[PDB]
Design a protein around this ligand. Structure first.
Ligand SMILES: Nc1nc(Oc2cccc(CC(=O)O)c2)c2nc[nH]c2n1
Length: 291
């Protein structure tokens, strides 16, 4: 039972707590209602600022509810996430024109958030939401900074999309962490398999190294001074993208390689990525959603 909502139904266990599908009692609309699993006043103010952000490729934060010493976030509900859509599309693959549309849209949403000095820090297929009109939207922008290195979830957290600087213990987040994650998601849409499905912080880092080569001071000045860098890390040579994401074409592989540079400073920006030749013929196809 809830004092302001009716027909509350659990969607799943989110990064910050349980997420419900809920029907506002006054208005009848259906929203995603996120109960933050506390044991953070600064976290109200900061998240409340995110109510002001509005872009077609960002899931709207409708409200921040602090009542009865509980904290809830209210977002615009969408019917499917990209993880479920990829699973539903596994036999055929997501068509290339739709992969390209979704990547383009996701870059537009990141470029918007980054221009407003908001990072995600934890993009993953389970917080990318899709609708029947061919849109894809990013949920939970800005929450990690406002929450913050900290775990609020009971589920196994996924590491598969974490940038290598994070895994190497750098406590300084930049826009580049979101480009990395999106590159990993791009590769997963194309190949129908996760790019780096690590089961721990070291297995994640070693999966990256075995594909991209062990980083060194030549490709990543400063890497050998990251907090968790060890000189004893095996030295793997780097494989070619052509083996990693076939049959993605020359344009897609070039863009992906720029999204996956080791040095965050060298990683393409969202804005620059939107100008890449890969998007010359981008379109907005209609997806086949089974709800
Ligand atoms: N249907 C739906 N689901 C959402 O988030 C979930 C719901 C459950 C789990 C996760 C995964 C995670 O948090 O790791 C995200 C929404 N956010 C805004 N609108 C939303 N609509």
């Amino acid at each position: 039972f809830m004092e302001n909502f009716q027909k509350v139904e659990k969607i799943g266990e989110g990064t910050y707590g349980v997420v419900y599908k809920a029907r506002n009692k006054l208005t009848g609309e259906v929203v995603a209602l996120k109960k933050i699993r506390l044991d953070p006043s600064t976290a109200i103010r900061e998240i409340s600022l995110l109510k002001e952000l509005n872009h077609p490729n960002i899931v709207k934060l409708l409200d921040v509810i602090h009542t009865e010493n509980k904290l809830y976030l209210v977002f615009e509900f969408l019917h499917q996430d990209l993880k479920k859509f990829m699973d539903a599309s596994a036999l055929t693959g997501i068509p290339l024109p739709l992969i390209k549309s979704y990547l383009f849209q996701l870059l537009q949403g990141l470029a918007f958030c980054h221009s407003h000095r908001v990072l995600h820090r934890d993009l993953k297929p389970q917080n990318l939401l899709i609708n029947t009109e061919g849109a894809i939207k990013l949920a939970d922008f800005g929450l990690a900074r406002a929450f913050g290195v900290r775990t609020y979830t009971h589920e196994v957290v996924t590491l598969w999309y974490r940038a290598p600087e994070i895994l190497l213990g750098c406590k300084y987040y930049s826009t580049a962490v979101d480009i990395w994650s999106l590159g990993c998601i791009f590769a997963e849409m194309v190949t129908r398999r996760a790019l780096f499905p690590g089961d721990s912080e070291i297995d994640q880092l070693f999966r990256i190294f075995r594909t991209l080569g062990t980083p060194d001071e030549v490709v990543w000045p400063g890497v050998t001074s990251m907090p968790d860098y060890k000189p004893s890390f095996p030295k793997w040579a780097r494989q070619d993208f052509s083996k990693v994401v076939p049959p993605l074409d020359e344009d897609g592989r070039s863009l992906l390689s720029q999204m996956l540079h080791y040095d965050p400073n060298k990683r393409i920006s969202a804005k620059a990525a939107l100008a890449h030749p890969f998007f010359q013929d981008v379109t907005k196809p209609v997806p086949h959603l089974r709800l």
